[PDB]
Design a protein around this ligand. Structure first.
Ligand SMILES: CN(C)c1ccc(CNn2cnnc2)cc1
Ligand SMILES: [Zn+2]
Ligand SMILES: [Zn+2]
Ligand SMILES: [Zn+2]
Length: 459
C-alpha cells in the first residue's frame, strides 16, 4: 500500500451542483475516465492522477491550490485560480487576466508552475476543494502517460510540448504548452461539514474571500496545510535537500555556541534554563554554569504562553540566571533571555506560506511555525553581530588581506592587530551568521548584554 488504488471510492456529493446526476457510487478509475483521460492499463510509474494524504504530505513543496469558477461549461468562460494568486480567464471561443483561448492559457499555466516549482519540487500536486469545473477543465492543459525523463536533463518530466513532441522538467520547459503527469488531491474527501470558507475560517483570519478563484485556491491549500501540519504533526517524514539546508543548520549550531558562550562569560549567570527541544544537548559543554533542561516540542499552531511554560508549580525560579529559547516560540519572552526566533515572513525555497500568518519551514523535516510577532521581544533587544574567541593565535596548515574590525573580540585585536587564524575564523563565522540571518532566523538578547564585557576575559 504505497499509491492510491484507482478502485478506491470517491465521494461525489461536492460535484453534483456543477455535474447534476453524477453517480453516488464512483471510483477514481471512473472519475479519471469521466475527466477525459485514458490510463490504458499502464504499469509505468503513474498508477493514478490522485494521491493519498500521506503521499501529499511527503510532496508538500509541490502543492498548488487550484480552483475553477464559472464566469457565466464549454459555452461560458472559466476563471482559473491558483494559490500563487494568479487568475486566468479561459474562453471556449490577486492578479486578474482577461479572457483568452485555451491554446494560450495553457502556455501561461506551464510558465507559472515551472517558475513557482523548479526550485521546490520534481512535480506538481493540485490541491482541490472539488466541485466539478476544475476536474473537467484539466483535459484542456494536462496530458498523461508513462513516467518520462526531461529531454535536456535526468530529472522527471513535468511538461510536454505539442510543437516539438518533447518532454521537459520545470527547469527546461520554456515554450512548453502542456502540464505532464500532474498529481492531485481533493480535500473534500477527508470528511468535512460545510463549505470551504467555513472550514478554512475556523483556523485562519489572514486569507479573505474576495470571490475570485485564486482566493478559494489559497484557502484550499491553507486548510490542507492546517490539517496535515498544524493539527496533525509528523517529524519522522524526511524531505530532500533542495538548497542550503546543511550550511544553514551548521551555521545555526555555530551561532548558538558563540552567543551562549559569550553571554555566560560576559554576565556569569550561575544557572541557565534551556527551554525547548526534548532532545537538546548543552551547546556550551565546557561552561561552568548549572544547565537545566525543560522539554517543549516545536509549537505548530499558536506560540506557547509563557504563563503555561513557567507557572502552575525545575529550579522554579526562571528569574534566576538566564533562559535560553532556541527556536522555542513563546508569546512574550522574559527579560533574562537569549532567543532565536524564526521569522515566518522570510522569502526562501525552504519557507512555504502557511496557515493564519504562520509558515511551513521545510528543512529535513516540516515545521509549521506560528506567525512572527515583534511584541514577543518587548523585554529584549536585537543581538548585535560579534565574533568571540579565546583560542590561541596560531595559523596551522586561501590568500590574506589583513582584518580590521571592532567586532572581532580576540586577544590579538585587544593587543592591536588581528592574527591570520582569528581573521580566517572571523570571516567564516560572519559567513555562517549571514547565512542563518538570510534563512529567516532572528536573534534577541537581554538588554544588559554588552560585548565590552568580553575584553576582560583576556588577562
Ligand atoms: C511568498 N510567495 C510569493 C510565494 C512563496 C512560495 C510559494 C510556493 N508555494 N505555494 C504557496 N501557495 N501556492 C504555492 C508561492 C508563493
Ligand atoms: Zn530538465
Ligand atoms: Zn488561510
Ligand atoms: Zn588571534
Amino acid at each position: 500500500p504505497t499509491h492510491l488504488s484507482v478502485d478506491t471510492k470517491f465521494k461525489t456529493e461536492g460535484l453534483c451542483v456543477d455535474i447534476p446526476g453524477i453517480p453516488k457510487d464512483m471510483t477514481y478509475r471512473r472519475l479519471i475516465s469521466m475527466m477525459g483521460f485514458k490510463m490504458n492499463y499502464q504499469v509505468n510509474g503513474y498508477p493514478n492522477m490522485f494521491i493519498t494524504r500521506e503521499e501529499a504530505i511527503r510532496h508538500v513543496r509541490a502543492w498548488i491550490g487550484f480552483d475553477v469558477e464559472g464566469c457565466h461549461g464549454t459555452n461560458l468562460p472559466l476563471q482559473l485560480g491558483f494559490s500563487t494568486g494568479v487568475n486566468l480567464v479561459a474562453v471556449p471561443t490577486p492578479l486578474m487576466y482577461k479572457g483568452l483561448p485555451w491554446n494560450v492559457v495553457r502556455i501561461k499555466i506551464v510558465q507559472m508552475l515551472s517558475d513557482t516549482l523548479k526550485n521546490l519540487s520534481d512535480r506538481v500536486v493540485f490541491v482541490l476543494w472539488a466541485h466539478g469545473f476544475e476536474l473537467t477543465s484539466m483535459k484542456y492543459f494536462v496530458k498523461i502517460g508513462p513516467e518520462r525523463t526531461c529531454c535536456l536533463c535526468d530529472r522527471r518530466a513535468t511538461c510536454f510540448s505539442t510543437a516539438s513532441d518533447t518532454y521537459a522538467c520545470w527547469h527546461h520547459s520554456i515554450g512548453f504548452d502542456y502540464v505532464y503527469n500532474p498529481f492531485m488531491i481533493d480535500v473534500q474527501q477527508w470528511g468535512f461539514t460545510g463549505n470551504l470558507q467555513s472550514n478554512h475560517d475556523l483556523y485562519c483570519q489572514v486569507h479573505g474571500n474576495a470571490h475570485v478563484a485564486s482566493c478559494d485556491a489559497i484557502m484550499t491549500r491553507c486548510l490542507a496545510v492546517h490539517e496535515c501540519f498544524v493539527k496533525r504533526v509528523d517529524w519522522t517524514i524526511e524531505y530532500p535537500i533542495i538548497g542550503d539546508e546543511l550550511k544553514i543548520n551548521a551555521a545555526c549550531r555555530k551561532v548558538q555556541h558563540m552567543v551562549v558562550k559569550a553571554a555566560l562569560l560576559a554576565d556569569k549567570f550561575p544557572v541557565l534554563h534551556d527551554i525547548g527541544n526534548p532532545k537538546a544537548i548543552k551547546c556550551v559543554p565546557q561552561a561552568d554554569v548549572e544547565w537545566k533542561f525543560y522539554d517543549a516540542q516545536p509549537c505548530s499552531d499558536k506560540a506557547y504562553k509563557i504563563e503555561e511554560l513557567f507557572y502552575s508549580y525545575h529550579s522554579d525560579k526562571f528569574t534566576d540566571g538566564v533562559c535560553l529559547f532556541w527556536n522555542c516560540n513563546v508569546d512574550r519572552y522574559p527579560a533574562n533571555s537569549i532567543v532565536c526566533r524564526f521569522d515566518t515572513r522570510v522569502l526562501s525555497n525552504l519557507n512555504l506560506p502557511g496557515c493564519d500568518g504562520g509558515s511551513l519551514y521545510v528543512n529535513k523535516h516540516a515545521f509549521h511555525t506560528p506567525a512572527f510577532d515583534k511584541s514577543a521581544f518587548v523585554n529584549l533587544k536585537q543581538l548585535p553581530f560579534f565574533y568571540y574567541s579565546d583560542s590561541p593565535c596560531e595559523s596551522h596548515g586561501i590568500d590574506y588581506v589583513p582584518l580590521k574590525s571592532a567586532t572581532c573580540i580576540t586577544r590579538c585585536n585587544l593587543g592591536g592587530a588581528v592574527c591570520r587564524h582569528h581573521a580566517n575564523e572571523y570571516r567564516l563565522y560572519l559567513d555562517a551568521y549571514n547565512m542563518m540571518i538570510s534563512a529567516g532566523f532572528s536573534l534577541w538578547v537581554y538588554k544588559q548584554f554588552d560585548t565590552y564585557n568580553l575584553w576582560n576575559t583576556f588577562t
